[PDB]
Amino acid sequence: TLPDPLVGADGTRVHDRATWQHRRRPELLQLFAREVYGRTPLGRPEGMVFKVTTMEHAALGGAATRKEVTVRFGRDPNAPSMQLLLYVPNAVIARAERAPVFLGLNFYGNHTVHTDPAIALSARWIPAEAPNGANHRATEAARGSDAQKWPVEQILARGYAVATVYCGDLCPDRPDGLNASVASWLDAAAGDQRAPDAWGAIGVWAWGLSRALDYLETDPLVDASRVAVHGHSRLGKAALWAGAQDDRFALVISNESGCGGAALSKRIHGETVARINTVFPHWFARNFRRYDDHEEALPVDQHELLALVAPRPLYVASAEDDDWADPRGEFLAVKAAEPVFRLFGQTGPSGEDVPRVNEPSGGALRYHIRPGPHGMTAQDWAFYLAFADEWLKSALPA
Template sequence: MKKILLLSIFFAAIGAHGTKSLAQEANYDESKVPAYTLPEVLVTQDGRRVNSVTDWETKRRPEILALFSEQVYGKTPTQKIPIRFEVTDLDRNALGGKATRKQVRGYFSVDKAKYMDILIYLPNRVGEPISREPVPVFLGLNFAGNQTVHADPDIAITQNWVPAWKDPGIVKNHSTEESRGTRARRWPVEQILARGYGLATVYYGDLQPDRADSFNAGIHPLFFQKDQARPADDEWGAIGMWAWGLSRAMDYLETDQEVNSKLVAVIGHSRLGKAALWAGAQDERFALIISNDSGEGGAAITRRGYGEQIERINTNFPHWFSGNYKKYNSRENDLPVDYHELIALMAPRPVYVASASDDQWADPKGEYLSAYHARTVYALYGKNTLSTDTPPAVEVPVGQKTWTGYHMRNGKHDILLYDWTHFMNFADFHFGKKQ
């Protein structure tokens, strides 16, 4: 009887201190969004107002970047490790002559055990020599291996661990021939090439497996101190690692004479949209940044308390963010930043945010509002942005010719040709004529 009583008290205490919010249904009711005050983007931590680009770049921007680094994604190591790139495949007549295909392996360790594979398609223009002008490129991570983005039989199949997605061709967490092209709907390669853009992609599992026990399985150990087994609370989680990988792919693209490395757009969907945003915030070489359905910890305003929230994401995916981010479980208002400031870190570079109507978990309105509330920083640079705090109707893109674009596609959590079409339209405006 005493044991039962003690257990009852124990579980009552748990319910009163943090897990109650996990038992509740996610809020999908706008009328239940709490009143909130966003952190001031243009007010420094000591209360001074920022009125110039110089003050933004030398004072406020470094403050915000440090807060995201320490409290959200974790610090990216400043330590450099030797990386060697090797072109493992070059086909000038890929996809029936439409493309030049390159496969590049980037080795992170001397023993070659740690590496990432970059798949690159560049457009071939009929009647023009291969030695054409360098082309702009979209760079993004993929979820299940490079071979899934297209049915091209010559793409190397990843040998690394793959999550147990429901896609065909995954057997015991490894990819088989059947996995070729299974996610081609998310990567409209031919349409991207036809628009004059190249595509580069890396399997995110090359960098770190997407599972909670993975800190010793990816690139993290290359940066550990002696006897360290996992990142410290203020050090990077998986999203930080994936963002780092995007920058390392950019390192290669800068060496490729067929790529216009000044015109590289970094793109990501869902958790990889979070990684794309964090990569764009840290690495100013990316000329354009695209977030698709990135939600909590990505583009969405966390203080809205709508859809996925901090405690839920930290519980379901404890490896994604820094240990410090868990301090804000059910305490969104205590977080010293919000995600409009993440968008603001991209300024003056263009940013496109996309949502889906049935993906309320990612809070489409909150994603839109982040792009909108970043406007004050873009204004310092004289850049026009989204002009209203009212999101547009479904499939009515806005800001296509401004520095912050947005659309909400009809449908579910996904990235489809509709999304890519508007991403390319946005890219056309910002660097299409500079090709």
């Protein structure tokens, strides 16, 4: 039985957009921060520094300008940082127009998104599942190892820049990764044990996406008011929480984010709260473990996270064989968020059950399910590019 996003904490119904934006959104943001992801202790830190470390105007055979940028989270050179890779379509640059941007984290390092041998090899720890790693470090054989999830040439040809950062720059994806992470520094606690409401990996990854947007606001080649934040799987959980917390993001894409992402936790289907917290104890707040085998006690569900994106366009997608993510739960979260989108004059999927494969449904709130297993495929991206053409903030209001 789902909590109603349009009923406030005190039981009063939300009938208008101002009550939604100024009362209900803060209530939900605080519930997710306290009970699920942990508190984001601050947004933009003081003294952010942006260093363009490499710049190539004829990358990908002339199709793109490629920039690598160190985004340092404080002015002291000792402060933590992350490494942003940006490809910008040269057709757009050449016209003296700013490009819109797709921004998302990657799993195994910037060098894995494209074979491009000029990308810096990540020097950070990488997980054992990363293809062609050696002792948790990047190798030359890992270049372009994750390119199937990143159709860079097509995204550029459709007029969009591609920006990415390795999630492990922000928090390495290992159960002890928080002690190396941005959280070991921002949270800024003297003691050792993280607090019950302290953020975990998903919060730190989401924060990094907002810091990447801070960089994009300074880059004269891109339109930082037209940034689509996207993610696959655990990085799509991060993309949703980033897009919910930071309304500067113009469009949000959740590709198979599943449990603690788009899927309703109260369905108890596929991955559950207990399973995700037991296997990935660093991903959420310790407070989320209260709901292990007790999803009925959750004061929110993920449809309210989706609702926190409204009125901005939101795309949630699933894979047909990906039972662990609970595709029906991802779809039903979209349906239960739709009333908030409708309050803003937007339309969601028609249909009461999961659509047929490869048949997207919805307006600015959209869903598709594609054949096959968990992944992010060219078919997913084809649909996302069409959505961004239609619903991403325009270059005009002139």
